[PDB]
Amino acid sequence: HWGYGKHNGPEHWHKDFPIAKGERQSPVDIDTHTAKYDPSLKPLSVSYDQATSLRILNNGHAFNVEFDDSQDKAVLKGGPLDGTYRLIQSHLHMGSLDGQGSEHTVDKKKYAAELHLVHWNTKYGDFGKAVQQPDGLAVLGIFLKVGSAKPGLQKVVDVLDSIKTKGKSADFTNFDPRGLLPESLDYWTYPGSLTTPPLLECVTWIVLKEPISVSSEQVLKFRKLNFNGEGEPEELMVDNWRPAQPLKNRQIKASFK
């Protein structure tokens, strides 16, 4: 099974998933020098007033959250998006050192971690059908930097022990995505893919420029999660990030001047 180790990491994914070498792979390094302001980008719209989180889980790859996507309670519109995209999940890629952890990089700089909020184009009926489409998903990436504690993350941090091993999950109805959003919504957008197998190129990436802060203690708790299952030898869930992939001449657009 795929992973992040020497024998099953990103260097191996292409064998089982040949698209790993596609023309629209994620993540990419955001080169501010080549990125270009796109005046035709409409204002980003994040409607997260209605709560929809159902539970937190450990799938042996990364910490994640599943949200109730039965209705248009938490959606993403505007920016480069055509239509309405419904929030279905969130995943956290984390490093083993504060100097690394993010999938996307800005001018080669890596952050301690990167949080993703996955949305699907409601024109496709459901998540499953959406991921088979070039414009089926819209993913909001948020960089995490070490510093002040992030209030909207403490509730999760206190119950991480309950989902320490893969296959574990806990009910969690108050994971408010509004509480992990930065002050500014400035972002870079580019056509890409999922950052883990199946690596489908069905994603419109919206990476927020401004990172949020989280305390050392909060990061340390997420670094205590396990890639392994219960009773199995311990493998800390750290460095579960894919390195920057070939841009292949794709165009990264900025929402700001």
Catalytic residue among 7, 14, 61, 104: 61
Number of H helices and E strands in the chain, helices first, is 4, 15
Residue 7, annotated as binding a ligand: no
- Residue 182 in contact with residue 208, Cβ under 8 Å? yes
Experimental method reported for this structure: X-ray
Residue 34, annotated as binding a ligand: no
Q: What does the alpha-carbon distance between residue 187 and residue 113 come to, in Å, rounded to a whole number?
A: 17
At residue 185's C-alpha, the angle toward residues 180 and 186, to 5°, is 135
**Collapsing DSSP states into helix, strand and coil, what is residue 112?**
coil
Residue 104, annotated as binding a ligand: no
Is 14 catalytic? The answer is: no
- Supply the CATH number for residue 69's domain: 3.10.200.10
Amino acid identity, position 102: S
Q: What does the alpha-carbon distance between residue 18 and residue 12 come to, in Å, rounded to a whole number?
A: 10
Question: Which conformational region is residue 134 in: left (phi greater than 0), alpha (psi within -120 to 50 degrees), or beta?
Answer: alpha
* Phi, psi for 18 (deg, rounded to 5): -50, -20
* Phi, psi for 15 (deg, rounded to 5): -60, -50
Domain containing 113 equals 1-257
Number of domains in the chain: 1
